[PDB]
Enzyme design. Structure first.
Site, PDB file in Angstrom:
ATOM      1  N   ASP A  84    -113.597  26.336  16.639  1.00  0.00           N
ATOM      2  CA  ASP A  84    -114.812  26.304  15.822  1.00  0.00           C
ATOM      3  C   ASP A  84    -115.784  27.446  16.944  1.00  0.00           C
ATOM      4  OD1 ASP A  84    -115.209  22.893  16.628  1.00  0.00           O
ATOM      5  OD2 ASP A  84    -113.925  24.344  17.462  1.00  0.00           O
ATOM      6  N   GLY A  92    -130.256  16.611  18.149  1.00  0.00           N
ATOM      7  CA  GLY A  92    -129.571  16.700  16.816  1.00  0.00           C
ATOM      8  C   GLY A  92    -128.455  15.696  16.730  1.00  0.00           C
TER       9      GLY A  92
END
Length: 259
Positions: free
Chosen positions: A130, A17
């Site tokens: 995160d 990705g």
């Protein structure tokens, strides 16, 4: 250059990705070793920030955090060679075929590992910033490891709206307690098998809700256990919120009950 490695020893293969600061490839280390390498495309980030988050784990290291390995940076592109997790993000995994295939036993077993490595950073006196199913990669053997550390701190790391806590969003108060809040949103993320926190809404209309003491209802099924061991994390009063060890720990006890 301790953490230094020469080029040519890195052979890029799969694309995996990417993002707005580079990509992730599935390369090889002097052949024979499946490895992911973070790209970083010029004029997007820097060369000290990409080599910035590379120092965090360059000193974090734990069995629940995708640990470093080596770096490649003496001429663009800049690399960050770390552990490989065939399975990929926990978010996708649970959405894939075998993902929904498994059940609580393994699911409950996950929040436990996140909670574990999370309890780690809590000690090292850090913050992820995160912490969400997308940032957690799965080991080729179904092991849970916390990845990424761009927002990690001891000028802004908050992005994950539907995960950040009212305090850090309202007054900019990011703390270990911010991540605790995030563990509930993450917990909710697995029992539903990868659904987005507060569906139908927009992370824009989320800022609000909070102000008005808004919380998602228990999940359609999930035993109160996790749901209440979920309301723990959402205690507006940053304090009222447990510490990981506790979660970590309670995620073990109220676990076996399952298996």
């Amino acid at each position: 250059d301790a953490w230094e490695i020469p080029r040519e020893s890195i052979k890029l293969v799969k694309r995996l990705g990417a993002g707005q600061f580079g990509e992730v490839w599935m390369g090889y280390y002097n052949n024979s070793t499946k490895v992911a390498v973070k790209t970083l495309k010029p004029g997007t980030m820097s060369v000290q920030a990409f080599l910035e988050e590379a120092n965090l784990m360059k000193t974090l290291q734990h069995d629940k955090l995708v640990r470093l390995y080596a770096v490649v940076t003496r001429e663009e592109p800049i690399y960050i060679i770390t552990e490989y997790m065939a399975k990929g993000s926990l978010l996708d995994f649970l959405k894939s075929d075998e993902g929904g295939k498994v059940l609580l036993p393994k699911l409950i077993d996950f929040s436990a590992q996140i909670a574990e490595g999370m309890a780690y950073i809590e000690r090292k006196n850090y913050i992820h910033r995160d912490l969400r199913a997308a940032n957690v990669l799965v080991s080729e053997s179904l092991m849970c490891k916390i990845a990424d550390f761009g927002l990690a701190r001891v000028e802004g790391a908050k992005f994950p709206i539907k995960w950040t806590a009212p305090e850090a969003i309202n007054f900019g108060c990011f703390t270990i307690k911010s991540d605790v809040w995030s563990f509930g949103i993450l917990l909710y993320e697995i029992v539903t098998y990868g659904k987005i926190p507060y569906p139908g809404r927009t992370n824009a209309d989320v800022m609000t809700a909070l102000s008005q003491g808004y919380r998602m209802p228990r999940v359609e099924n999930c035993p109160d256990e996790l749901y209440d061991i979920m309301k723990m994390c959402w205690k507006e009063k940053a304090e009222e919120r447990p510490t990981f060890d506790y979660l970590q720990s309670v995620l073990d006890d109220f676990y076996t009950a399952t298996e």
